[PDB]
Amino acid sequence: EKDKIKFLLVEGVHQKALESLRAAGYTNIEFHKGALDDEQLKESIRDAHFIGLRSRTHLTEDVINAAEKLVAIGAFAIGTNQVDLDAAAKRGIPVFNAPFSNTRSVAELVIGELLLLLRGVPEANAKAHRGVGSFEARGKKLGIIGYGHIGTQLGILAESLGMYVYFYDIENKLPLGNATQVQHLSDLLNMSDVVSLHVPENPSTKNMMGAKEISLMKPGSLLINASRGTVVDIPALADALASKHLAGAAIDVPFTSPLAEFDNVLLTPSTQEAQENIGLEVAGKLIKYSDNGSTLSAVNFPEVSLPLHGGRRLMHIHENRPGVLTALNKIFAEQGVNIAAQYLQTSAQMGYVVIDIEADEDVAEKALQAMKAIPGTIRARLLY
Amino acid sequence: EKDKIKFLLVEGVHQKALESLRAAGYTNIEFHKGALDDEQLKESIRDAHFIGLRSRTHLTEDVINAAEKLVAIGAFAIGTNQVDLDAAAKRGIPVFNAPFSNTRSVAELVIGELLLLLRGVPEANAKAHRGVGNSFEARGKKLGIIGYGHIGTQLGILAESLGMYVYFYDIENKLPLGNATQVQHLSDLLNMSDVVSLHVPENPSTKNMMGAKEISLMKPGSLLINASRGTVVDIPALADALASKHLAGAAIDSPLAEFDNVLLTPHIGGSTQEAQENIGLEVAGKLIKYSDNGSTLSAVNFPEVSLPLHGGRRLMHIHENRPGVLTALNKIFAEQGVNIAAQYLQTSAQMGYVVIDIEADEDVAEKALQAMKAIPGTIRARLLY
Amino acid sequence: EKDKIKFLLVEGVHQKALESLRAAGYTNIEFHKGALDDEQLKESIRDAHFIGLRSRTHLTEDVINAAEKLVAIGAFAIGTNQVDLDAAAKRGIPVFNAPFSNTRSVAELVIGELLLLLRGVPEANAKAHRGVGNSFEARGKKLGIIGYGHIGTQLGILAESLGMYVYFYDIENKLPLGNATQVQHLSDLLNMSDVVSLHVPENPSTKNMMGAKEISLMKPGSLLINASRGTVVDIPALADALASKHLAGAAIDVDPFTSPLAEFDNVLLTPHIGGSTQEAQENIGLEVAGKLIKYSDNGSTLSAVNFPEVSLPLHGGRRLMHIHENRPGVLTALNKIFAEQGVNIAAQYLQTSAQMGYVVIDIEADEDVAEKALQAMKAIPGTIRARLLY
Amino acid sequence: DKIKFLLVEGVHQKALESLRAAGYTNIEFHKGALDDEQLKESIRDAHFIGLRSRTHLTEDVINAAEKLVAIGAFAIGTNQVDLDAAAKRGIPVFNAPFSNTRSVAELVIGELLLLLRGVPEANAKAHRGVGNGSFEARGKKLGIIGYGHIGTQLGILAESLGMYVYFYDIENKLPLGNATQVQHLSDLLNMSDVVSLHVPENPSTKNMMGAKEISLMKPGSLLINASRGTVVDIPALADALASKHLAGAAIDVSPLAEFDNVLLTPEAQENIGLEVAGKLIKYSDNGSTLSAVNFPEVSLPLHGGRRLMHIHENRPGVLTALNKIFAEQGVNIAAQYLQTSAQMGYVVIDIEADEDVAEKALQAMKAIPGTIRARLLY
Ligand SMILES: NC(=O)c1ccc[n+]([C@@H]2O[C@H](COP(=O)([O-])OP(=O)(O)OC[C@H]3O[C@@H](n4cnc5c(N)ncnc54)[C@H](O)[C@@H]3O)[C@@H](O)[C@H]2O)c1
Ligand SMILES: NC(=O)c1ccc[n+]([C@@H]2O[C@H](COP(=O)([O-])OP(=O)(O)OC[C@H]3O[C@@H](n4cnc5c(N)ncnc54)[C@H](O)[C@@H]3O)[C@@H](O)[C@H]2O)c1
Ligand SMILES: NC(=O)c1ccc[n+]([C@@H]2O[C@H](COP(=O)([O-])OP(=O)(O)OC[C@H]3O[C@@H](n4cnc5c(N)ncnc54)[C@H](O)[C@@H]3O)[C@@H](O)[C@H]2O)c1
Ligand SMILES: NC(=O)c1ccc[n+]([C@@H]2O[C@H](COP(=O)([O-])OP(=O)(O)OC[C@H]3O[C@@H](n4cnc5c(N)ncnc54)[C@H](O)[C@@H]3O)[C@@H](O)[C@H]2O)c1
């Protein structure tokens, strides 16, 4: 929304990212197919309002402090280990990544794994390669644990394969297609011919699939954990495979070493069709942060976003010290200006707040100046 | 989550709602299979903190103002015309409906409508019934979806199953389902589509968004579908495009009664029988979360607020929208010596609602609560946890 | 696949048809965007071995007999009202149409009908256009398919994708696709179905198979769809069932036959059904061009509309074909001919009709003997035409 | 109906259901396989025998039979049956050709999904301790060669996964869904990200996928052969794998054992039961030998009238004799379908006549030299 806002994109992010940026009115783009050298990065990033990078660019504390106009960082990938998160945060610079771009990919893999495991293909294949010398998926029940981005897309594909889909989730969800939410996990485990996990990594899920749960699964069933974490007690999984209670499994990958001996287990390890989704996803985050201040899904920043309801919108980033918010609201109160919406979120170190006001530019601009002055302020900006 | 919080459910909402309420720790439930007479409703709702009803129960201003403990209203259906929204709002009472349980039926409806419209069936059928004597496959056709949310995504899935190519336009990037493709400019989506279906909310950004200009950008001989909305399409313009034959047909909802190639579906806000379970789950969920964390997401007569749960203490304040409320709040926490961890204030009409998370002990939180209730213009405030 | 084989195509058949012919080695093609006048037609179809036409071409006996090289006619459409079937048959000229090109289109139509009928849209729509003022999801419902053939099968696939449970009744055992289930007894399929769709041909076994008794057997509040045909459903019984509300609605392909239904707002009457646009045109083009190619190369008359149907698998050797009047002695004459040449018949397929017979014969012999047999076969009394396919 | 049905190795209850459905009662069932002594005893008066992969139906056992009309192999196909001995006796052997269609289509989907992602190789390495392809299926093109039972069901599943389906066949096929026929094999091969073969085993398919065909395939593509034949030239495929021209493959079972990016593979008994039992019944009723594995295939449309069938040694003069019989009797032949195999000849003849005229032609047909058997079907 201004050709003065410079976007520096390196390591060759997908073209759709550029298409998205231009459609939103941001055409001041410096593009690079490969990584920049230290000296090249420093001079290109110096006046960049935004930088988009992948895995090879190292955004160290020094490079960041060197950038004098940096507003936000877009990690066009899932990982952000190449970016110094804390350094960016201290300067009020959010880092966005692409957390859901691999959704479809994981769903397809699960389908491929269950189809072959159900037929005992992995074991037959390993023996064939050594010189040594089974059911249809349709009509079978798939039990999905975690019915979110991946869980829902998987259920859709499973139904297309003629499977009956059931899911367990700690939250009530709207079923897509003929899927059925099962309230008790043990009930899901009992019915399921195939069980697939798609939950996040947290105390709630730590070893949720232990000896007991695996014991609850149907005799001859399959356990899939296509996306890597710590949700499955590997030793317990190994015992159930050795005992043959489970006819096979697929686990994302030592730690899985106990499974290496099993021919009926599939062990599987940002360079494919993911680039388009990533380009669209991350450019979108940069665009929205620029236009409306949304930090939803930022990885090193308090998360906030507010619907577009007209009026003027300002944003304030500050060290989380008592008195800042009081100073902020005072600016509008002592002036009789009304606040239509306000959303503040904090961390131990920082506080981020977006405010919608009913006023004209003059007042808005004036308010912005006062805001920047408030002690503890890191950055302040008038969004519209 | 207390067992003293009374839930009054009338007109026989699905048993799943009760199970859900019980699972959330709410067991103080009065349940009736049907509607009650004016006398019974008044007696039953007098001490009800929450009421769940359907289309028959008339929750009028009188009834509302008489219910002295009412905290929230849940319409276990889509419509809320039987509920006096403004009356409830004035009392700081949000009204929740079931905005998503009927997602699937709207998607199925659009598929049925486009399939027949494409073949010219509505027109051929109307003439056939009048005695007057008298097409395209959907397969390989492009479906343009405006608003890729709950309905758009499900519609896209069904359309791809019919062999159609799905493209969509939205005001933000959306993760696509199947082979659906996002299109950055609305004009481009309109240009390429053989069928355009609208699935967006009602609000200044969508009022008449499909006007004479947008409709003329649609492909010649295309179809426009507005399955369940309100004021998104400029009717005069649509009639004009139909008369000129720019569009081969449409489905909506008049000046359109003259067109045999237009399907008119008088009121669709009706929830299906198969959806009663989902509705019970959906609306009970809304009441529960409002009661527990103050979320007013999806409320139909209230500013929408929702703050992630990060422990600590949480307070909520409903008031007359005006400058100085927030400042009045800051001073109270300052005097009380507490820092605000998170805050979310939204306004709608002449009303303001704000949820505040603070780190403080029970006593301090209560003292803050009493002060907050004394702020002039305050409608009500409570300590959620 | 020689070059002396001419293809006359009028009324602009789809390019796919030509691509198909060429790929098959038939390049001698005379294309025309539209129909030709009586003078031009006779002039063009003069030395044409094959002709492909549509609806705007009248192939009369005069035109046909005028043609001295015509071996087969391609009607790139469903109907063949425009061609003199008997005249072609008398000349030993088979007529091929596009029997299954509209399969997908009908299956799509059924889905659209049941979706709207299930929600009561036809009725609400009719009332709305009149000023008068004013429902179940398809997902989870059971679809009962009577006749699991071309359409039945594609319909079932679309229904399952819509989340419906598919069951079908057919007089012959079928390999179900997806989760489809074959039901042995009609009464059973009829009792369990929320929607029943008919996709059977018009023969004695189907004549009014859906009578008052069958309809009464249907689940109360169900839908009946017959999106093609005309003799499988008893309209009077249907109207009664709709009047009593035993059925919630219906879709019937339409007319004195459907008049009893005109008063029902919850019934969809749909005329034109057979020949969409470029899309249906592409299927048709590929289908009929294929028929012509197969007839030319191996003598197959499967699906011909005015000819005995014969089709013999390709097993090498020499292939001859003989078209004749159904008079006695022809079959005997054929044998005698091969005995004298001391040739063995590997396979023979003869089929007949009114007063005409068609036989394809596979023999073991050198071209030399083949051609000698061909000439002999042509001299058989009652012979209309004979050819050496390969 | 003195039509005894001997069933061994325990065929699914459905076969029994089916036979009964057609009145055909009299069923000697044996959950297990009988032996030489008992087998000859039970098969002695057996009209139809149903067996699996273990029964050894030798020339002796068959010769032992005296009323055997057909043999139903309720399995992947013929097994320990002396097909040749069976044919000599004018006895067709029916198997279950399309019963596991769905199963093969599902297998191909599973294989291409993993191969596209390089999982086979990654998995092989992971099981050897080593650590370290990869693409989604949606948006990719699947090239099917042989658009028949399996090909069509495969296309349906492929499209549901978001793939674009193209197929090549030797005749025009009605496409299901968005499947598109491609006229030239070379075009199909080059455009495909995945090629799967579903063609019959015969001369026109033997090694049809050679060095030339494989070189025409897109670089980094996958070749899948679930067929039960030798359609692919392994030596050529191996070369294409070593050179990385192909990113992987899946084949039924070696030179490919060295390739980690190659998949090597080996209750539905209900289908088999209903399919095979269905062949046995149709043959008894209308004489159809469609799909028989050791018999000329003949199938004639039921158009009323009388239907006579004749099985004979392929001696010249049989057809001459047959047609002379009807000629002399002044009986018109409505339809006639004769097909032959290396040793046998089978013809079905439809005529317009009453019982009298029929049985008259039947006795004369039985008297022809080379006759193995002849029956009045109806
Ligand atoms: N989607 C992607 O692109 C991607 C990429 C890499 C890794 N992952 C990983 O895959 C997993 C799932 O990802 P997603 O995108 O579908 O996540 P998601 O957030 O959309 O859904 C996770 C689901 O799990 C449910 N859940 C949480 N705790 C649960 C519990 N204890 N029991 C049952 N259900 C519970 C949640 O309510 C939610 O519906 C996560 O571990 C994620 O980190 C996803
Ligand atoms: N889901 C149901 O059961 C149901 C029942 C009756 C009526 N409706 C109506 O259908 C509409 C959409 O419902 P939904 O469930 O899909 O809602 P939703 O919130 O899930 O999705 C609406 C989508 O519209 C997009 N959008 C918003 N403003 C837009 C604009 N100006 N231009 C383009 N896209 C825009 C949003 O980003 C979002 O993705 C609403 O008007 C709703 O009242 C829904
Ligand atoms: N497929 C098309 O393109 C097309 C175009 C125009 C009209 N039609 C009409 O649609 C109908 C069906 O067409 P189709 O292409 O699927 O035909 P089809 O021949 O493929 O299948 C008809 C099915 O009906 C079954 N059947 C026959 N008699 C039966 C009986 N008495 N009871 C139960 N099942 C019986 C048959 O076994 C077969 O499976 C026919 O009336 C046909 O004329 C089809
Ligand atoms: N369907 C099953 O259950 C099953 C089980 C085991 C093995 N098989 C094997 O799979 C293969 C195909 O099985 P199906 O059931 O789909 O057979 P099918 O007969 O239904 O289809 C084979 C298809 O191949 C086409 N074709 C023939 N020769 C061709 C050629 N040279 N090039 C291209 N296409 C050609 C045919 O026209 C036909 O459409 C066969 O080898 C069969 O023995 C099938």
SSE ordering of chain A: EHEHEHEHEHHEHEEHEHEHEEHEHEEHE
Please give the largest β-sheet of chain A: 7 strands, parallel
Structural class of chain A comes to: alpha/beta
Determine the strand fraction of chain A and express it as a percent band: 15-25%
* Number of alpha- plus pi-helical segments of chain A: 13
Large-scale geometry of chain A: elongated
CATH class descriptor name of the largest domain in chain A: Alpha Beta
The fourth-level CATH homologous superfamily of the largest domain in chain A is: NAD(P)-binding Rossmann-like Domain
What oligomerization state is this entry in? homotetramer
What is the name of the CATH topology of the largest domain in chain A?
A: Rossmann fold
| Hetero groups | nicotinamide-adenine-dinucleotide
Q: What is the C-alpha radius of gyration of chain A, as a whole number of Å? A: 25 Å
Distance between the termini of chain A: 11 Å
Helix content of chain A: 25-40%
> If classified by CATH, what would the architecture of the largest domain in chain A be?
3-Layer(aba) Sandwich
Counted beta strands of chain A: 16
Organism (chain C): Escherichia coli (strain K12)
Subunit structure (chain C): Homotetramer.
Domain ACT (chain C): 319-390
Keywords (chain C): Amino-acid biosynthesis, NAD, Oxidoreductase, Serine biosynthesis
